[PDB]
Design a protein around this ligand. Structure first.
Ligand SMILES: CCCCCCCCCCCCCCCCCC(=O)OC[C@H](COP(=O)([O-])OCC[N+](C)(C)C)OC(=O)CCCCCCCCCCCCCCCCC
Ligand SMILES: CCCCCCCCCCCCCCCCCC(=O)OC[C@H](COP(=O)(O)OCCN)OC(=O)CCCCCCCCCCCCCCCCC
Ligand SMILES: CCCCCCCCCCCCCCCCCC(=O)OC[C@H](COP(=O)(O)OCCN)OC(=O)CCCCCCCCCCCCCCCCC
Ligand SMILES: *C(=O)CCCCCCCCCCCCC
Lengths: 99, 540, 122, 87, 155, 79, 65, 177, 128
């Protein structure tokens, strides 16, 4: 069977008190009473200023030190023209053709 | 020179700036998650320029910018390594992370700790880009322990739940068992090669390198959820869906695979390490993809899916083809993050429902989620000329055509069939069939956050495999002459998996009640492995 | 994949092992067999930074393909013919390796017939 | 997501489930309609009515409370107790 | 709190057993202590060694995360039988069959990996042939010495 | 606020597999009481879901049309 | 207007989500058929596989003794 | 077995609980709705086939072999509701269920942000502290000697009095704080 | 017919298949009534002090204080020298020490024998 009438009246009274509690958990339209207190700024303050700072740090403190920024040498092909020496790399042999 | 290294460090400093923003606050933020999403968008756009000038030439360098500690022969400098692996993993991780956070503005919108959530997620991103830009083993150990600790903090996000803290502590335990092997590897390289820097490790070229490679394989077994140490990744679906989408699909769980890819000049001179990786990876991709065949929680199914793909990565490291494994990482990231995002959209639409036995009818009910999840499942199975074709099938083309363990190859092909089996299982129970969920349909996916976040990874899952696979320089020679039964192996076994599992799916509409035998009870209880070792080993 | 069953389920004496081969002289059966001609100069690929797997007898097409792939930026799909040249030359090198394997198989069949005729005669 | 339910809405959904049930005539069903005493229903039918409520609203009622809901007014009151409606 | 509610020595007389069962707030007939060998348990009850997962999950507990009541004598390993740790819950498959299936699957798979490592698969091709004395200077050969000539031939 | 529910008499099981369930119960002498509560899952806009080959081939018509138009464009442009 | 939840029936669809879903389905099929047209060799094969049994003894150097 | 109000499950309650858990494991085995609907009517008919059985020992015997049938035909992972224990969303928001008494320990400048709320909370505290001694003396004479036998609490009796041991039931946190 | 569930220490017997749930004898009735009485009495004595508005503090559990005083403060006076406890104090107290001692001594004697012969690979080992 269901509940005893003591249990039913107890759930009735507890449910009334719970619904009054939850109804009192609602807020006023004046609550909360708060205390009395540039379109591309993100691209400027988060990109351009960090690029400035990091390029200054890398140029005048990191590259001034030996072997800190070690760049891999660029891949040289037959047919290249060197900007430093000025000598054009002689090309490959004529191919033993296959098609 | 002046542009490459500058924008390299600008990406990382730009990721660290919202940590200073969230720590230097007094007021209530005007949508700090929008600020972090805009920040990671900008960090992706910043990191794309060194990627383009690496595609142009192949310009690698090292930024050893801050001399930190000199222990008598060990100059620990803050040293960043911009090679092919950093240049192809950092923009993919940033793109996936930006998609996950625009997903997270919607999925975690009712959270009153949304600022702490995006702070922890950005801390995870910072630690992972420490992990993949590291040039010495100490900084890589910083990034390694960092993604382990953010794994703890983001699995136990709803910390009032006991199972979330349980899964977080479990994940910590298996990752520290991997850390045993990683600290073993650091110890071997310091005592025998006097270095943690990768340059001197590659130059000195050790021959008796069985012990450090076993240490690295144990580190990857802990981190990438391989066999023996896998169950924390099925437990790790307890956290939020962007946690299991960002971390445990595409960004954290590839770190052990990334560790073994980073050490390819040592693994290419050792047949024993290649054999151990091949056997363990075939074991993992069999076992986890088999355990995916019998699950009903959708996040468990996609967790076993991503662990099976990590086992496939371990296989294609074991066949001495590291760049194909790394291309499978950079391919896998897009559609597996998208599959977790679509599963989370299904979960949030059905009022936190993760069980596929109470899904269905979502073909036209969630049409954008239906479209994106079908494209993700096809790119998982290796549909031709989607993104998952441009690495995974090639893996099979080099797994057949090499001096290889034959049983590992056969288990790889069985796992390839199992992927199609659980993919059409996902499509059949989730998107197909009839509605099995409750009666107040609050199904909705009309937020521009959700649409744009799935949309950018969908453009990725359509185009990024082609674009990345054509933008690489060839670091290997591709095996392109093979017999026709051996060229058509992966596609045929995938279609056979499709058809056999369509038979398995059409058995469900028959009105016949069968008792489950030892196969279903074996696989449904996670191959019996998280049952014993989580009850018997902490008891002793 | 017939050679797996022919080496494992048949007899092993006639199928050539992968590890230690060629077990025969290069000119055993070859009168005036020419040497392979190398097209790429050694310093030209020492300056091309090629992978040591890729420094085979056909890396000159790979050097041309990498010069194309560098020069044709950003048009990353404008080097299909150099790629197909290099893939065709890799295909010919693979056919030459197949010819090596088939030469070893037919010489082991020749040795089998030779020892059987020697046993049946003497 | 998860709309705020009201007692009128919960009552209409409970009576909408129980009017879709072939052993309840929809003109005799009221809020005080007992199941074993105003509808003459079986205890097995009461278990199936509570299970239909569970499949309806998306949560499980324990058996110590499922064995004691014997009219739809108590069902709406228990869902109000376990959902905190009229806040 | 005072002295006669704290744990004391192991009980010997049955009236000490009854006073301890009143002390530990439980029935006398269900009061069973640990075996007196000197491990230091005292008069502490042997609870039936079931974890907190099998406790009633819907019940109004005093400690709902631990599923336990006030004054009830806790298990000796109450820190160990938490729901973050080792469970006692029944599985639909028996323990011994799980041990057999897991050990047999691991052993059979690793044995088949060993068999396939003994019997490799490969391609009907020869070795990859390399120019310049099989790449002597590229593999790190010293330039003062000269190796044997590794010359390959057309086929 | 107040959400209106639809009719409870429109959800009858003629045309649904609940009819086949009730026929297989009547063939052994049983009755289904819960057909009308299960009636909405098989009717309305949740009726006639696609097959798996119908799910994979979503958007195949317009994709095939775009394929034919673009291949015609590159075939008429290459001259 | 947002998507109001409905009861026991098919929910309200925005036109935009449906046309974007159909557009990405058609984009998938356009890309698959386009790359299957232009390449046709990453799936089927790039070069013809020869037969080692058909090779003569003169090109392999097998004098019959 | 373990009940708050009573001390045992009756035979009728055992049959109800076994029937309900049997249908839940059945629906776990019978994913689709019509197939479960047919098998649910079959299981209902099988429970109806032994309904009017008068011998209690024979009924306990049939309930014993019914428990064996239940254990033989169960699902390894049954369907669990999310807010139900064992579910994926169970005790998720218990990190947000802050108790009420911490509201008694705020700074006044953050109590002045919500004036009406604390001004309305003070009369709840007044009602509690002037109802407490009345409900204590209602407990100590209505509870029999030797402690209360069952865990059931009595309701109030007088028009103007509150039920005993009520405060942390009424002021318990919401399901979605 | 059907498989019996065989119990385990780590996977105990369920509530349903245990026979002592299906006993209806009078001593089971009286033991359940006594456990209900003690549990209801302790529940009432708890949630009086729990709901007590004068108390602003910690409802002390004598069971929790009893458990904490058992885990630490009953260790030494209830220790008696016998066979089982002394053999476990020797097996678990100094056994693994002897094990790791002979393992580490064997390993370092092997390594020092290889080093003094000049046979160990110690080429780039200058950090130690
Ligand atoms: C955000 C605010 C920034 C400043 C804004 C306002 C200033 C104007 C903008 C430009 C910046 C300031 C001028 C340039 C900077 C100073 C240049 C200079 O001389 O620097 C001296 C030095 C350079 O190093 P050094 O080698 O010259 O000196 C080290 C000292 N010895 C050699 C004895 C060991 O210091 C720095 O530049 C410090 C920069 C640190 C940046 C990274 C910090 C990471 C912290 C991690 C801690 C743990 C690491 C563990 C792992 C390490 C690896 C194994
Ligand atoms: C890549 C090419 C994919 C298409 C070619 C292969 C299609 C195929 O295998 O078809 C067989 C089968 C369809 O046949 P069946 O389902 O029996 O037909 C009744 C109603 N369609 O089954 C299927 O079509 C299902 C498998 C489709 C897999 C597509 C992705 C690969
Ligand atoms: C290349 C080689 C690769 C080799 C691979 C194989 C080697 C490793 C073998 C397996 C080792 C790990 C597995 C055994 C321990 C697992 C412990 C664990 O994860 O426990 C999980 C458990 C909770 O998990 P669960 O019950 O599943 O969660 C459901 C939610 N209630 O959580 C708990 O119960 C909490 C337990 C806390 C106390 C634990 C005490 C024991 C600690 C053991 C540490 C092991 C150290 C190993 C050192 C190895 C050195 C080489
Ligand atoms: C000769 O047959 C050896 C080939 C390599 C080992 C066997 C591979 C078998 C599986 C590949 C073909 C699958 C076709 C569906």
């Amino acid at each position: 069977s269901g509940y005893t009438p003591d249990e039913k009246l107890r759930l009735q009274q507890l449910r009334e008190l719970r619904r009054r509690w939850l109804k009192d958990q609602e807020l006023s339209p004046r609550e909360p009473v708060l205390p009395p207190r540039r379109h591309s700024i993100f691209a400027f303050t988060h990109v351009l200023i960090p690029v400035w700072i990091i390029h200054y740090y890398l140029k005048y403190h990191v590259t001034t030190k030996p072997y800190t920024i070690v760049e891999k040498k660029p891949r040289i092909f037959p047919g290249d023209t060197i900007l430093e020496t000025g000598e054009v790399i002689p090309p490959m042999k004529e191919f033993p053709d296959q098609h | 020179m002046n542009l490459f290294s500058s924008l390299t460090l600008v990406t990382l400093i730009l990721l660290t700036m919202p940590i200073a923003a969230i720590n230097f606050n007094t007021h209530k933020f005007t949508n700090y998650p929008l600020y972090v999403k805009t920040t990671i968008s900008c960090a992706f756009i910043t990191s794309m320029i060194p990627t383009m000038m690496f595609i142009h030439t192949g310009q690698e360098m090292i930024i050893s910018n801050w001399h930190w500690l000199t222990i008598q022969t060990l100059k620990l400098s803050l040293s960043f390594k911009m090679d092919f692996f950093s240049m192809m993993f950092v923009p993919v991780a940033l793109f996936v992370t930006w998609s996950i956070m625009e997903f997270s503005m919607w999925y975690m919108h009712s959270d009153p700790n949304i600022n702490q959530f995006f702070k922890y997620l950005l801390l995870f991103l910072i630690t992972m880009l420490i992990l993949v830009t590291a040039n010495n083993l100490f900084q890589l150990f910083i990034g390694w322990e960092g993604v382990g600790i953010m794994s703890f903090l983001l699995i136990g996000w709803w910390y009032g739940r006991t199972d979330a803290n349980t899964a977080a502590l479990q994940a910590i335990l298996y990752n520290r068992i991997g850390d045993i092997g990683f600290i073993l590897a650091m110890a071997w390289f310091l005592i025998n090669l006097n270095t943690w820097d990768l340059q001197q490790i590659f130059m000195l070229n050790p021959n008796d390198s069985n012990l450090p490679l076993m240490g690295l394989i144990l580190a990857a077994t802990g981190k990438s959820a391989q066999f023996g140490l896998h169950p924390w990744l099925p437990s790790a679906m307890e956290g939020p869906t962007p946690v299991s989408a960002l971390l445990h699909s595409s960004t954290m769980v590839v770190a052990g695979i990334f560790l073994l890819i980073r050490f390819y000049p040592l693994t290419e001179n050792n047949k024993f390490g290649q054999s151990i990786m091949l056997c363990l990876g075939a074991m993992t991709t069999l076992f986890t993809a088999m355990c995916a065949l019998t699950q009903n929680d959708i996040k468990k199914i996609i967790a076993f899916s991503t662990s099976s793909q990590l086992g496939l990565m371990m296989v294609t490291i074991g066949i001495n083809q590291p760049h194909l494994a790394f291309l499978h990482i950079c391919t896998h990231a897009f559609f597996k993050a998208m599959l977790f995002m679509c599963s989370g959209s299904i979960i949030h639409s059905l009022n936190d429902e993760q069980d596929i036995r109470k899904m269905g009818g979502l073909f036209k009910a969630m049409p954008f989620t239906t479209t994106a999840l079908i494209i993700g499942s096809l790119a998982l199975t290796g549909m031709p000329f989607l993104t998952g074709f441009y690495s995974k099938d090639l893996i099979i083309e080099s797994a057949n055509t090499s001096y290889t363990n034959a049983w590992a190859l056969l288990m790889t092909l069985v796992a390839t069939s199992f992927t199609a089996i659980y993919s059409t299982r996902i499509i059949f129970f989730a998107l197909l069939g009839q509605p099995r969920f409750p009666t107040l349909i609050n199904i909705n996916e009309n937020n521009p956050f959700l649409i744009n976040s799935i949309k950018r990874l969908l453009i990725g899952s359509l185009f990024a495999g082609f674009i990345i696979s054509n933008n690489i320089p060839p670091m290997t020679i591709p095996q392109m002459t093979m017999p026709h039964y051996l060229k058509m192996t992966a596609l045929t076994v995938t279609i056979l998996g499709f058809i056999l599992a369509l038979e398995i799916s059409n058995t469900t509409h028959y009105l016949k009640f069968n008792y489950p035998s030892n196969t279903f009870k074996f696989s449904n209880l996670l191959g019996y492995y998280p049952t014993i070792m989580h009850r018997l080993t902490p008891y002793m | 994949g017939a050679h797996l069953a022919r080496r494992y389920l048949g007899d092993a004496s006639v199928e050539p092992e992968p590890l230690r081969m060629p077990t025969f002289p290069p000119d055993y059966g070859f009168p005036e067999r020419k040497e392979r001609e190398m097209v790429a100069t050694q310093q030209e690929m020492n300056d091309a930074q090629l992978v040591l797997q890729q420094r085979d007898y056909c890396a000159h097409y790979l050097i041309r393909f990498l010069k194309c792939k560098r020069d044709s930026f950003p048009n990353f799909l404008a080097c299909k013919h150099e790629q197909h040249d290099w893939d065709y030359c890799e295909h010919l090198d693979y056919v030459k390796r197949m010819k090596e394997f088939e030469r070893e198989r037919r010489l082991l069949q020749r040795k089998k017939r030779r020892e059987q005729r020697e046993a049946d005669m003497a | 997501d998860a709309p705020p339910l009201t007692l009128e809405g919960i009552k209409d959904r409970v009576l909408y489930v129980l009017k879709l049930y072939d052993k309840i005539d929809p003109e005799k069903l009221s809020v005080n309609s007992h199941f074993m005493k105003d509808l003459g229903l079986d205890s097995l039918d009461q278990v199936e009515i509570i299970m239909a409520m569970e499949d309806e609203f998306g949560f499980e009622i324990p058996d110590i409370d499922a064995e004691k809901l014997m009219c739809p007014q108590e069902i709406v009151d228990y869902i109000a107790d376990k959902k905190d409606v009229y806040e | 709190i005072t002295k006669d509610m704290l744990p004391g020595p192991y009980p010997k007389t049955p009236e000490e057993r009854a006073a301890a069962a009143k002390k530990y707030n439980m029935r006398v007939e269900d009061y069973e202590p640990y075996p007196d060998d000197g491990m230091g348990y005292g008069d502490y009850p042997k609870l039936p060694d079931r974890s907190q997962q099998e406790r009633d999950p819907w019940y109004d507990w005093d400690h709902p995360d631990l599923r336990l009541n006030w004054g009830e004598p806790m298990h000796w390993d109450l820190d160990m039988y938490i729901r973050n740790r080792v469970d006692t819950s029944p599985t639909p498959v028996n323990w011994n069959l799980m041990c057999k299936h897991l050990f047999g699957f691991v052993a059979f798979m690793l044995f088949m990996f060993w068999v396939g490592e003994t019997y490799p698969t490969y391609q009907p091709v020869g070795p990859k042939q390399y120019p310049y004395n099989n790449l002597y200077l590229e593999r790190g050969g010293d330039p003062n010495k000269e190796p044997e000539p590794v010359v390959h031939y057309e086929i | 606020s107040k959400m209106e529910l639809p009719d409870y008499k429109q959800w009858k099981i003629e045309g649904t597999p609940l009819e086949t369930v009730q026929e297989k119960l009547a063939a052994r002498g049983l009755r289904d009481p819960w057909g009308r509560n299960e009636a909405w899952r098989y009717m309305g806009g949740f009726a006639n879901n696609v097959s798996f080959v119908g799910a994979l081939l979503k958007g195949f018509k317009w994709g095939f049309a775009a394929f034919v138009v673009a291949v015609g464009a590159e075939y008429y442009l290459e001259s | 207007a947002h998507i109001e939840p409905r009861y026991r029936q098919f929910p309200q669809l925005t036109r935009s989500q449906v046309i974007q879903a159909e557009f990405f389905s058609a984009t998938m099929w356009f890309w698959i058929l386009w790359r299957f047209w232009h390449d046709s060799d990453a799936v089927l094969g790039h070069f013809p596989y020869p037969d080692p049994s058909q090779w003569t003894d003169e090109e392999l150097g097998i004098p019959p003794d | 077995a373990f009940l708050p109000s009573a001390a045992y499950l009756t035979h009728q309650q055992k049959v109800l609980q076994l029937y309900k858990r049997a249908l839940r494991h059945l629906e776990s085995r019978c994913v689709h709705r019509d197939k479960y609907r047919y098998f649910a009517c079959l299981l209902r008919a099988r429970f109806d086939e032994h309904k009017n059985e008068k011998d209690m020992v024979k009924a306990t015997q049939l309930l014993r072999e019914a428990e064996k049938e239940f254990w033989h035909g169960q699902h390894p992972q049954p369907y669990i509701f999310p807010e139900s224990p064992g579910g994926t969303s169970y005790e998720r928001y218990e990190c947000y269920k802050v108790p009420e008494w911490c509201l008694d320990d705020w700074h006044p400048s953050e109590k002045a942000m919500y004036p009406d709320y604390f001004a309305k909370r003070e009369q709840w505290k007044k009602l509690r502290r002037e109802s407490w001694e009345r409900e204590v003396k209602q407990l100590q004479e209505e509870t029999p000697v030797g402690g209360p036998r069952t865990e059931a609490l009595p309701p109030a009796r007088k028009q103007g009095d509150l039920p005993p041991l009520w405060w942390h039931i009424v002021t318990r946190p919401r399901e979605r704080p | 017919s059907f498989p019996k569930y065989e119990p385990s220490r780590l996977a105990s017997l369920p509530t349903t298949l245990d026979p002592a749930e299906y006993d209806i004898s009078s001593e089971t009735r009286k033991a359940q009534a006594e456990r209900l009485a003690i549990r209801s009495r302790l529940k009432r004595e708890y949630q009086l002090q729990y709901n007590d508005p004068s108390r602003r503090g910690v409802v002390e559990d004598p069971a929790l204080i009893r458990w904490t005083c058992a885990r630490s403060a009953n260790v030494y006076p209830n220790f008696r020298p016998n066979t089982k406890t002394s053999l476990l104090g020797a097996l678990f107290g100094i056994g693994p020490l002897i094990f790791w001692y002979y393992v580490f001594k064997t390993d370092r004697d092997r390594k020092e024998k290889l080093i003094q012969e000049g046979k160990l690979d110690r080429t780039f080992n200058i950090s130690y």
